[PDB]
Amino acid sequence: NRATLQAI
Amino acid sequence: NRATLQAI
Amino acid sequence: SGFRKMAFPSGKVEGCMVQVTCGTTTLNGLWLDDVVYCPRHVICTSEDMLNPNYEDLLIRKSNHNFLVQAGNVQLRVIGHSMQNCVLKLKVDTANPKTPKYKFVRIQPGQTFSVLACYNGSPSGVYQCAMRPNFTIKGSFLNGSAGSVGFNIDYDCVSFCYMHHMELPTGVHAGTDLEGNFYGPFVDRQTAQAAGTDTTITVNVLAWLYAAVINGDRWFLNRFTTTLNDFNLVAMKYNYEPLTQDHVDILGPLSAQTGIAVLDMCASLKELLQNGMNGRTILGSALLEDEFTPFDVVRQCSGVT
Amino acid sequence: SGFRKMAFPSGKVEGCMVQVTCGTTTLNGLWLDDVVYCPRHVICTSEDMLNPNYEDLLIRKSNHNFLVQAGNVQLRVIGHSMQNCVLKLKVDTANPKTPKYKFVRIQPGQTFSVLACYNGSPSGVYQCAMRPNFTIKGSFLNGSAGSVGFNIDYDCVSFCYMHHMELPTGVHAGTDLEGNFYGPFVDRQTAQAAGTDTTITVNVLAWLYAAVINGDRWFLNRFTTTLNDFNLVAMKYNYEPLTQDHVDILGPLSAQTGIAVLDMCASLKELLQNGMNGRTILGSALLEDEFTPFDVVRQCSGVT
């Protein structure tokens, strides 16, 4: 599993 | 025990 | 993801908070348009508080007995009146920071944000539920009376609570913004106790759905149950009965997760009968009941 | 009385929050004086985020690629630069609502308030601790990057955190306001994991003191222990070592309660070895470690 950058 | 009104 | 006890942003309420002093007694008031609302016991002296006659105490005051301070600006009081357990102090200046607002009374089981205040100055913000016994488990010290509880929808603040007093067990009691107490409490320093409390079942279910949405699935099981058989278990463990309206309200969360409400009730039954055998749900080792279905959807979906 | 997880009033931060859009990517920025600070990955496209070269990505932008919106007012960008993992966007208007502020970096074990935001609009407020492994257990959804964490002292906002990303375990990672990450994390959508975490011992002790101050005394005992023998138990249960500086910091709470720090450590030893046998402390069935000694003194004493 990967990190998620939390812009949209 | 008694209730306390919480002004000061 | 993640699930936290979350309050509404408090700025809109902070700009309404003032300090109200009568004689040697001081507390907070709520300044909306040209009126300041505060707990009526600001007019008590210390020895007035065991058995106050408020109508007598108020007749003996006039406008110049009330010092209202908005920051370091005194607001001149030009009228006063009693409404149930609050005072309405008419002042000469409308609050320029008055938000769109509503005075609403809430139900037991519903939540709201508390802006704790001292001397007219906001101190901190936290989330509370109205307990089935009409108390709230807050954090309040002497001087905090007049702090308010609220919900925000769009840009409208719905005020639902004003703080008055602490009961002997350390729980808190207060009024709606029309000055009517929540529960069978009076603003007197007398022996008073809350009715027996109960656990808010629909909220526990909502929090279990939050847990699944965040990946805690260990308490799930292949069993289902009937509403009738679940409510027999709820009554034994001092949980409120679950209604069909509760099942309906949980609809969206049941859809999102694919777990039928009565399937989730089978999990709750097992947790009630067996405990968690050392595991946690959303970081808690107890079943949490102060999140409504709305609070869960709000946070597990992100309405700003 | 009562003890609650309590955030700082958020109004002063709400007036700084803006929306920053680059291309099809949008997040929040922090508007202080004539500069907007935001996570640099606003300049990534979706396919830019596995292995971005940020210096390349930024060279290919200019001022008119950044849309900054403060409410329903666009702010014109007149300069841009990268500083570590944040962007500094110079705008033509100083924020009239800029509070007194400081950029501070905090230590693991310290707490702060998070103002969660989406599209420049505040959504909710909650309290977080910086974990020993430099993550925070927050509540953040896509779009929440650029939300900030802070403490307030007098009228000064000390910003300590800006949110960037969620790790695979559901915990959160971000930077200080100079753009330096907390912990060994990078702003890339790669496999990354936090180091093993540990429990913040001084905070657990502080919360036990809060419990006594609020009348939960059942876990107290007539035993004491040595710092050395306590730290042997702490290491076995994955608690951080307790220092003499921790004992000192707990001084005021130990005085208020009359319970020596090493006496309270004997209680914690027993709780660690035997659990709570079905009882609770301050409404929790687990030992809580996200309240600092300052948080306890603040709330059990009432600084507004």
Author numbering:
A (entry chain B), B (entry chain B): 118 to 125
C (entry chain A), D (entry chain A): 1 to 304
Paper passage:
The SARS-CoV-2 translates its genome into polyproteins that must be cleaved to release individual proteins essential for replication of the virus. Given that Mpro processes the majority of these sites, any intervention that stops this process, such as an inhibitor, would block viral growth. The crystal structures of inactive SARS-CoV-2 Mpro, with the catalytic Cys145 mutated to Ala, with 9 substrate and 6 product complexes were determined to sub-2.5 Å resolution. As in previous apo and inhibitor-bound crystal structures, Mpro crystallized as a homodimer.
We used 12-mer peptides, P6-P6’ (with the scissile bond between P1 and P1'), in our co-crystal structures. Six of the nine complexes were solved with the dimer in the asymmetric unit (in P21 or P212121), with both active sites in the homodimer occupied with the substrate, while the other three had a monomer in the asymmetric unit (in C21). We observed that the substrate peptide was extended along the Mpro active site with the scissile bond (P1 glutamine to P1’ residue) positioned between the catalytic dyad in all cocrystal structures. The N-terminal (or non-prime) side of the substrate had an antiparallel beta-strand conformation which was conserved in all structures, with the substrate residues and side chains well resolved. The binding mode of the C-terminal residues (prime side) was more varied, especially beyond P3’ position, and lacked full electron density. In addition to the fully conserved P1 glutamine, which is stabilized through multiple molecular interactions, the large hydrophobic residue at P2 was extended deep into the S2 binding pocket in all structures. The sidechain of the conserved P1 glutamine was also extensively coordinated in another hydrogen bonding network. The volume from P4 to P2’ is highly conserved between all of the substrate complexes, despite the variation in amino acid sequences; this high conservation reflects the specificity and likely evolutionarily-constrained regions of the enzyme.
